[PDB]
Amino acid sequence: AWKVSVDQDTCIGCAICASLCPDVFEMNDEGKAQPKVEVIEDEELYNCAKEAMEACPVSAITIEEA
Ligand code: F3S
């Protein structure tokens, strides 16, 4: 279980995330990333989403674990 989130104020619509890792991060009505999933449990999906996080220029991707 890894829930993903994206601070809506930090984000600039740079869009490395939607590339890179597309099953996970999708560009909303106002050009700010959002996730397509409320939970990730596949690890290869996770990998791509952590990749995204390590990459986002303004770093507004936060992944989370329970
Ligand atoms: S800028 Fe926002 S659009 Fe994605 S790559 Fe960073 S979270």
Ligand SMILES: [Co+2]
């Ligand atoms: Co389960």
